[PDB]
Short mmCIF file of C-alpha atoms in Angstrom, two decimals:
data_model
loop_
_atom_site.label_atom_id
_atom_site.label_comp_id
_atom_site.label_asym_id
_atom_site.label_seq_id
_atom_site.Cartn_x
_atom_site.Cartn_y
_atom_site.Cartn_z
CA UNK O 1 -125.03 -24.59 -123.42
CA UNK O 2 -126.75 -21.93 -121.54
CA UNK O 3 -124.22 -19.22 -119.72
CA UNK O 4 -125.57 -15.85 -118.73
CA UNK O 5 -123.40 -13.03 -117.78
CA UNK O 6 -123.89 -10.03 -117.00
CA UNK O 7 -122.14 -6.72 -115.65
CA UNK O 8 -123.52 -3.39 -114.37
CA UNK O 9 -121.81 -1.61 -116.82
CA UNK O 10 -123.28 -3.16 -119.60
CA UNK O 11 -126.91 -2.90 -120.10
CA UNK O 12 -127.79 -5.66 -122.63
CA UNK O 13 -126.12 -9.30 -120.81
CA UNK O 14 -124.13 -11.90 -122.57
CA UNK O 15 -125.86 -15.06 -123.67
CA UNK O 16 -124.10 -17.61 -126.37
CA UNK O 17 -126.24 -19.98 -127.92
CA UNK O 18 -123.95 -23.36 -129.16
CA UNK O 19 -125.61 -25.21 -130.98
CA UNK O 20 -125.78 -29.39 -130.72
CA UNK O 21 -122.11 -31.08 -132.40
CA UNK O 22 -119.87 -27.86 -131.53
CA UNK O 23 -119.26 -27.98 -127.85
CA UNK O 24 -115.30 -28.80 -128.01
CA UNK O 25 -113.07 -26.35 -126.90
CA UNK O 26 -111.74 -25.03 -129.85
CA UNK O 27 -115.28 -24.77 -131.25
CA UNK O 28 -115.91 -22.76 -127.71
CA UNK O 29 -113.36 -20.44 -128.28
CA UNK O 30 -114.51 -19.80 -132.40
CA UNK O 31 -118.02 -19.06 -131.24
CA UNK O 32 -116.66 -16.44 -128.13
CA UNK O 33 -114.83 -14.82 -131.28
CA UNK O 34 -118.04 -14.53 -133.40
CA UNK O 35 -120.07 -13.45 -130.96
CA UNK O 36 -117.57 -10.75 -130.47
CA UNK O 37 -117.69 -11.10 -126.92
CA UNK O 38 -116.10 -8.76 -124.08
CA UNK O 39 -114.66 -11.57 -122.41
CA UNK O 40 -111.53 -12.95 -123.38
CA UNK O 41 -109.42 -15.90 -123.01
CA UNK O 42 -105.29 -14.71 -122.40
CA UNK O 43 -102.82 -17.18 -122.07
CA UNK O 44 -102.16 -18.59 -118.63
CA UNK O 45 -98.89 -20.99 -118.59
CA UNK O 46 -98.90 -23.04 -115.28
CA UNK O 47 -96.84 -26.38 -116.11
CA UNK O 48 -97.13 -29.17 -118.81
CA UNK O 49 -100.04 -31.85 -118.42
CA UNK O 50 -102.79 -28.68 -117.22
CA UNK O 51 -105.82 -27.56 -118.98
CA UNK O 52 -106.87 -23.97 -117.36
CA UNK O 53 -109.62 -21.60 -117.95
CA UNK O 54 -109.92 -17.71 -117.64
CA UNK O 55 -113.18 -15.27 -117.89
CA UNK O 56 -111.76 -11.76 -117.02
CA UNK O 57 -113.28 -9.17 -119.75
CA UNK O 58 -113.14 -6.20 -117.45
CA UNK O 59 -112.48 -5.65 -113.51
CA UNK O 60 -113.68 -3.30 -110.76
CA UNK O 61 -116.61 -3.07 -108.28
CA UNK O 62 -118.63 -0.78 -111.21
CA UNK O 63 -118.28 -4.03 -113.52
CA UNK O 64 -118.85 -6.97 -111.29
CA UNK O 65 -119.55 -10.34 -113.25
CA UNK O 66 -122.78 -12.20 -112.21
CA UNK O 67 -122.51 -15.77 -114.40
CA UNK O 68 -125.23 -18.05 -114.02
CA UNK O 69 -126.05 -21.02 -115.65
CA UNK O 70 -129.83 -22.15 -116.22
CA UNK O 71 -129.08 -25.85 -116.78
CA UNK O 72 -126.41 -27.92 -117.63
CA UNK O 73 -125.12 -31.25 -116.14
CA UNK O 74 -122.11 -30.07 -115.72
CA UNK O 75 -121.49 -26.56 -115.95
CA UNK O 76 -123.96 -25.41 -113.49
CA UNK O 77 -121.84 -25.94 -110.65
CA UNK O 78 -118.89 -25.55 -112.58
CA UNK O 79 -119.53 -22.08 -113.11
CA UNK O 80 -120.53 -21.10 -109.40
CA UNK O 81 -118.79 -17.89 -108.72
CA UNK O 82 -119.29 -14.81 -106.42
CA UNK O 83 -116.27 -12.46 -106.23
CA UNK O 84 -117.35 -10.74 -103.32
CA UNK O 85 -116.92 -13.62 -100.97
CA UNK O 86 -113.40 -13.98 -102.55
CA UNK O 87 -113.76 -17.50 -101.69
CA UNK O 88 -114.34 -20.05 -103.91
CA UNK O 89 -113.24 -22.92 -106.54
CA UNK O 90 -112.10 -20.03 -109.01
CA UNK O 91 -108.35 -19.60 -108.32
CA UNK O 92 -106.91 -16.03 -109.12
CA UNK O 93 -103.33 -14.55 -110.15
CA UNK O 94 -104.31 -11.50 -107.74
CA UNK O 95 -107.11 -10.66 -105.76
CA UNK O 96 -109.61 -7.99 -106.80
CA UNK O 97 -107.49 -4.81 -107.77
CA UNK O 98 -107.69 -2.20 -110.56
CA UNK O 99 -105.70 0.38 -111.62
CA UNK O 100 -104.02 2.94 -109.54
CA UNK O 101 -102.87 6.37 -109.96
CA UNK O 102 -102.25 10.10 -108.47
CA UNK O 103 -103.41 13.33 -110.27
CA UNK O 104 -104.19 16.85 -109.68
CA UNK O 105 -103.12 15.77 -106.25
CA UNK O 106 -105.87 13.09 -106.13
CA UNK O 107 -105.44 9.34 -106.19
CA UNK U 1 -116.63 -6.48 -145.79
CA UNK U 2 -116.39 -3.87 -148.89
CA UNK U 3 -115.54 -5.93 -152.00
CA UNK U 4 -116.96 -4.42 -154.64
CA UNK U 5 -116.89 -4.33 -158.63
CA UNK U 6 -116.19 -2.19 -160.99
CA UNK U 7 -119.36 -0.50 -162.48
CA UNK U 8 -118.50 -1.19 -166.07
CA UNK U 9 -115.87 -4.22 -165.62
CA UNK U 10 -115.20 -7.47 -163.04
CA UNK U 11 -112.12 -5.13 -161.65
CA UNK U 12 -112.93 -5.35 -157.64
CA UNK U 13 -113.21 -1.24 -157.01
CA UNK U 14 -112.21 -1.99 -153.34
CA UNK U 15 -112.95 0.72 -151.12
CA UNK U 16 -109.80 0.57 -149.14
CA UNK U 17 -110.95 2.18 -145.92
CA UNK U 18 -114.22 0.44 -145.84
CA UNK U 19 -112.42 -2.48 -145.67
CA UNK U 20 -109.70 -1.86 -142.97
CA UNK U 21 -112.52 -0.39 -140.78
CA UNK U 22 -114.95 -3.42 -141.30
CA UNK U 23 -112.42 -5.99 -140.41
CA UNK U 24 -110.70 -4.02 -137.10
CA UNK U 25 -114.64 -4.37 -136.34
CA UNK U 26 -114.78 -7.30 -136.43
CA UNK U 27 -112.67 -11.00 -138.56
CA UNK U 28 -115.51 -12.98 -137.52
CA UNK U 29 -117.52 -12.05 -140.44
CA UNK U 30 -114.85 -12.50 -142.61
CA UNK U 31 -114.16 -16.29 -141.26
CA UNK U 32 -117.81 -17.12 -142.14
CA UNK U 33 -118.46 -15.34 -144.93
CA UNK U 34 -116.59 -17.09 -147.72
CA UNK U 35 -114.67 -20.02 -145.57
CA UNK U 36 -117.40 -21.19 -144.32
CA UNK U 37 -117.04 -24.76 -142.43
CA UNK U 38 -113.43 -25.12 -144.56
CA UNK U 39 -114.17 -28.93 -145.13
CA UNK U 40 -116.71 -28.20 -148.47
CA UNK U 41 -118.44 -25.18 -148.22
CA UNK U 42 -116.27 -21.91 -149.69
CA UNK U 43 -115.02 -20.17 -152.82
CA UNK U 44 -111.83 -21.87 -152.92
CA UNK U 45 -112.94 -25.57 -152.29
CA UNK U 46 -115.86 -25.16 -155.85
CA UNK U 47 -113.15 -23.40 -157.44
CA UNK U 48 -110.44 -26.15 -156.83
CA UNK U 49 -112.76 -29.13 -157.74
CA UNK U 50 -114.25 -27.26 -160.82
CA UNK U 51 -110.34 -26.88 -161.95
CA UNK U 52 -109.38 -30.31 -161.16
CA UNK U 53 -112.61 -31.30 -163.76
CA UNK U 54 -111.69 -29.33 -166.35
CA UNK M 1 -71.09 -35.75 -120.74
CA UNK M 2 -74.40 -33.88 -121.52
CA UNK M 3 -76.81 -35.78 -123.84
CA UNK M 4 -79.67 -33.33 -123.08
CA UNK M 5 -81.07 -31.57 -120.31
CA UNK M 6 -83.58 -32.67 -117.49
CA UNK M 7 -84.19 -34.73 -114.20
CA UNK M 8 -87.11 -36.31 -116.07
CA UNK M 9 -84.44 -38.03 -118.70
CA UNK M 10 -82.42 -40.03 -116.09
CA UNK M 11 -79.08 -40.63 -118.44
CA UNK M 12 -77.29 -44.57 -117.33
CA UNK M 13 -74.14 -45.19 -119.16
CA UNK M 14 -72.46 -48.42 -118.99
CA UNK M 15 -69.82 -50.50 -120.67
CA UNK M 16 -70.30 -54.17 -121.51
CA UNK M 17 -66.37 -54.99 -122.49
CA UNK M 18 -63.47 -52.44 -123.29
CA UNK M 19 -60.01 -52.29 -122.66
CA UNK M 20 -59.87 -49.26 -120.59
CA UNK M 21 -63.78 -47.29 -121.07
CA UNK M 22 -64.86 -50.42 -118.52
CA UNK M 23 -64.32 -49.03 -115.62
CA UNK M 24 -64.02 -45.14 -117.38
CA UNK M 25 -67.97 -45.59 -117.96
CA UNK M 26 -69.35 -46.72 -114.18
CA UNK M 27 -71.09 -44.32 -112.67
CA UNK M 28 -74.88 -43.49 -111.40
CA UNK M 29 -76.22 -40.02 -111.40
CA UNK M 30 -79.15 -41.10 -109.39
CA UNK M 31 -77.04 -41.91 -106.17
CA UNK M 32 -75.11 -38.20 -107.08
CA UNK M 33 -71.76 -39.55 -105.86
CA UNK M 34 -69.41 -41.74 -107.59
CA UNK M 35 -65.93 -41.53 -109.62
CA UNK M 36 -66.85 -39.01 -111.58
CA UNK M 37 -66.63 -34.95 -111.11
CA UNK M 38 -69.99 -32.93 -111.68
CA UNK M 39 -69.49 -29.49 -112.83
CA UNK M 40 -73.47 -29.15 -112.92
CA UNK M 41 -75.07 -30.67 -110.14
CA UNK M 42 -78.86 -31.51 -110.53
CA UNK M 43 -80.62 -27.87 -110.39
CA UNK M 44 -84.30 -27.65 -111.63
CA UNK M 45 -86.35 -24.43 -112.78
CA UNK M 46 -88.11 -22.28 -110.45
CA UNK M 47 -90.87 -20.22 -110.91
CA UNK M 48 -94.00 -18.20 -109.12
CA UNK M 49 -97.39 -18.23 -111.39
CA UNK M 50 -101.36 -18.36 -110.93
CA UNK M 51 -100.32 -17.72 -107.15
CA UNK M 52 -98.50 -20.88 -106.80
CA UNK M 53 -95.09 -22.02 -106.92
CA UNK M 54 -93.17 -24.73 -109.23
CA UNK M 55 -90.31 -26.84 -108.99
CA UNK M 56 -90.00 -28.53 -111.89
CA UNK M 57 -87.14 -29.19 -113.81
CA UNK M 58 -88.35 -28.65 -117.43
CA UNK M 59 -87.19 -25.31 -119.13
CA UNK M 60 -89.26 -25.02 -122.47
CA UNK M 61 -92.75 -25.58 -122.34
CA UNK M 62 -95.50 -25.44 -125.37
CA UNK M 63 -98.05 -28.00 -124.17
CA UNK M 64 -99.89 -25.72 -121.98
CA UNK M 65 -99.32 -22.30 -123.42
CA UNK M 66 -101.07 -23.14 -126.50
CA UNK M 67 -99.49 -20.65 -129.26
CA UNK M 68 -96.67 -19.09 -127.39
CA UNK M 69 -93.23 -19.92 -127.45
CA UNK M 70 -91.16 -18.50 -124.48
CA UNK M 71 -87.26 -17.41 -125.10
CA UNK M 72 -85.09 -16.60 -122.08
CA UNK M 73 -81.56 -15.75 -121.41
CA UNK M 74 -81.38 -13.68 -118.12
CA UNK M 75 -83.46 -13.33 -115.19
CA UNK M 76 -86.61 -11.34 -115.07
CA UNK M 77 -88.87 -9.72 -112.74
CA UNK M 78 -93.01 -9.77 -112.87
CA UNK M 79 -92.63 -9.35 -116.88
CA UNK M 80 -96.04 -8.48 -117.89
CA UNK M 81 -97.03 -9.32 -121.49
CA UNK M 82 -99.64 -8.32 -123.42
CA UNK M 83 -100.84 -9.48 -126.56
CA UNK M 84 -102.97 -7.29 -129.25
CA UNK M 85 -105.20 -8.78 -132.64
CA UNK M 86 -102.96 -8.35 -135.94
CA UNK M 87 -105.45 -8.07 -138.42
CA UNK M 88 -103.07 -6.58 -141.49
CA UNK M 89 -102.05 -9.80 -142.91
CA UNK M 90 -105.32 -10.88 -143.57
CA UNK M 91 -105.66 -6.87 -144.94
CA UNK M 92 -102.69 -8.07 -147.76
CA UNK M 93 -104.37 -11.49 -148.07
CA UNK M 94 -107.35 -10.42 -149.23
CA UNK M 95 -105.72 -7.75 -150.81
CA UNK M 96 -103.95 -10.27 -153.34
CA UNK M 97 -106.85 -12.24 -153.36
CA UNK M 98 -109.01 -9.12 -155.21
CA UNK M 99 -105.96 -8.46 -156.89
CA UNK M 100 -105.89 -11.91 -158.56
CA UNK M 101 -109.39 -11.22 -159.56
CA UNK M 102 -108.39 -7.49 -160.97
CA UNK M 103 -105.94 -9.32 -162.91
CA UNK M 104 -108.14 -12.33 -164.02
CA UNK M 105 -110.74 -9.69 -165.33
CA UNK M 106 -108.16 -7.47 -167.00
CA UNK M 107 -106.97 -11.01 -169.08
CA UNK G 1 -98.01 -9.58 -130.36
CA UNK G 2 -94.45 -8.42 -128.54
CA UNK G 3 -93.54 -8.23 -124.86
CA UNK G 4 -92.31 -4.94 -122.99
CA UNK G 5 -89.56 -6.71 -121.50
CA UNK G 6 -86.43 -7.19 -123.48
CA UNK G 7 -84.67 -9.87 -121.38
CA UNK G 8 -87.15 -12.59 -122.34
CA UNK G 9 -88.79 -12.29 -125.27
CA UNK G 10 -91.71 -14.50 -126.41
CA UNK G 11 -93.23 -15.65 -130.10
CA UNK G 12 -96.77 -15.88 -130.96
CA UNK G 13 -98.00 -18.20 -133.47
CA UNK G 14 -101.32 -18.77 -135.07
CA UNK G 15 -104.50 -19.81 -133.35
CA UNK G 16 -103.59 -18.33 -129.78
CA UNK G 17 -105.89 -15.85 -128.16
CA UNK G 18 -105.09 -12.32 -127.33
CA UNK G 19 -104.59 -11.50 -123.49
CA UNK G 20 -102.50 -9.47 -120.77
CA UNK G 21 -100.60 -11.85 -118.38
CA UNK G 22 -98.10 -11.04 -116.03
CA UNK G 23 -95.23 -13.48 -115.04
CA UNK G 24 -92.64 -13.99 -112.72
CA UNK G 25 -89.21 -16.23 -112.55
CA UNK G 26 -87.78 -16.65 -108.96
CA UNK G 27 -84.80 -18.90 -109.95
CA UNK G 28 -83.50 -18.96 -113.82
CA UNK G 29 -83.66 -22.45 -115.92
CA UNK G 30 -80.79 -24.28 -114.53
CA UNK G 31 -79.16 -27.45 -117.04
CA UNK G 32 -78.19 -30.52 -115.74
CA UNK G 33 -74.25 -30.88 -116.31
CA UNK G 34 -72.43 -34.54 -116.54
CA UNK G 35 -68.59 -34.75 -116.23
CA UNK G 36 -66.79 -37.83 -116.48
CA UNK G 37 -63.58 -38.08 -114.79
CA UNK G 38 -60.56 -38.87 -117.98
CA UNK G 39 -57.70 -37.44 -115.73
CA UNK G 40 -54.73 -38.82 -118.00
CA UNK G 41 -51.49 -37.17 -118.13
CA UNK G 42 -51.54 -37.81 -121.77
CA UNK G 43 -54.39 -38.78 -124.41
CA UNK G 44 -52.41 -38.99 -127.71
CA UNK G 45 -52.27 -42.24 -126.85
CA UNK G 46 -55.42 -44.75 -128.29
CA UNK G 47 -57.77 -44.65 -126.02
CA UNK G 48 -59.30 -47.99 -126.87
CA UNK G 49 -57.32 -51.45 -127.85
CA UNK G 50 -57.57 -52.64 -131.43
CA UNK G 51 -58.14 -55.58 -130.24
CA UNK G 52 -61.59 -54.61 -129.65
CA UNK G 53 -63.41 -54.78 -132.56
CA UNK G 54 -66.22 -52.51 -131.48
#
């Protein structure tokens, strides 16, 4: 599987490299923990008989998430994204918002 | 990881803060370092089948 | 007369032959009116996530959530959870594992 | 891992990931209730025949 993404923020992009015989689930999720990868999976309960997916490692306009795919039969247009259209086949919780406070009489 | 023995003896001298800090970097390592796929490869599976011989 | 809980199991008690539980027993819940009282009538659980709200009747789910078992006794407002790495018991794992090894070499 | 709320409280076990989610309840779990109508004045008395065997 081929999945580049990359972030502003970062300067060196994430790239896995599964290998042939491990491309379940499960065996996704084992190699995003050895890679030690930024992005995480959290738990998303929607209702019984649903398989979901998340990719959120960070959020913000500095760390926007450009995720391209160089070729897969499947993937490549699974993984079609842009957030700043905020329109797309990736379904959100809430739309693109960070944290938000007020100090030294400054928000 | 850290695991180390004892310069005279087999008594694992582990350095106790070189291991916490090595596996809050990172478990990953730890999960493919001795278990290995789980099914044959690892410490405990030789160990177990070496036992059940003798 | 509560067997369990749920719209999903649709509970039909009948009597074949008895002396007074014949016509005691005759009664549809489907059709919601009949001889009997209801002290419960059908309610099913509500809730608001991924953006999208759900209906459905079933209280405790573990199919989708995937490692987390939800407990709930009153009502609760945009609860937001989050969940942190434990690394420590793999710390007094391996911790008894060397130890065994300490004591194998001190035999 | 433990919630911040204490009204519902949630249990983690092993082989989940690790992740911040935020949830909301607009109506709480409601249980389907049955009641059978056995309005008699007194029920010391059998309340099936013996001549039913079963």
């Amino acid at each position: 599987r081929t999945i580049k993404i990359e972030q502003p923020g970062r300067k060196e992009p994430l790239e896995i490299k599964l290998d042939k015989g491990d491309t379940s689930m499960e065996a996704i999720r084992d190699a995003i923990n050895d890679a030690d990868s930024g992005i995480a999976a959290s738990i998303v309960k929607v209702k019984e008989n649903e398989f979901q997916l998340v990719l959120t490692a960070n959020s913000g306009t500095d760390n926007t998430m450009k995720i391209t795919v160089e070729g897969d039969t499947k993937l490549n247009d699974l993984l079609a994204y842009d957030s700043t259209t905020n329109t797309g086949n990736m379904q959100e919780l809430v739309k693109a918002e960070n944290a938000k406070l007020n100090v030294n009489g400054i928000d | 990881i850290g695991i180390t023995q004892d310069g005279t003896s087999g008594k694992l001298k582990i350095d106790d803060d070189k291991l916490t800090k090595v596996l809050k970097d990172n478990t990953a390592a730890a999960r493919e370092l001795l278990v290995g796929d789980g099914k044959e490869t690892g410490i405990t599976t030789k160990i177990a089948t070496e036992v059940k011989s003798y | 007369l509560t067997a369990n809980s749920g719209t999903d199991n649709t509970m039909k008690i009948t009597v074949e032959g008895d002396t007074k539980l014949n016509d005691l027993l005759a009664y549809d819940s489907t059709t919601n009116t009949g001889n009997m009282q209801e002290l419960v009538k059908a309610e099913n659980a509500k809730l608001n996530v991924n953006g999208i709200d759900i209906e459905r009747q079933s209280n405790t789910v573990t199919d989708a959530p995937q490692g987390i078992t939800l407990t709930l006794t009153k009502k609760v407002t945009d609860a937001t959870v989050t969940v942190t790495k434990d690394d420590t018991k793999a710390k007094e794992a391996i911790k008894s594992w060397v130890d065994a090894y300490n004591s194998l070499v001190d035999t | 891992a433990s919630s911040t709320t204490e009204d519902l409280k949630v249990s983690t076990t092993a082989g989940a990931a690790a992740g911040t989610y935020k949830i909301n309840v607009t109506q709480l779990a409601a249980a389907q209730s049955l009641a059978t109508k056995t309005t008699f004045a007194t029920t010391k008395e059998q309340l099936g025949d013996t001549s039913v065997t079963s």
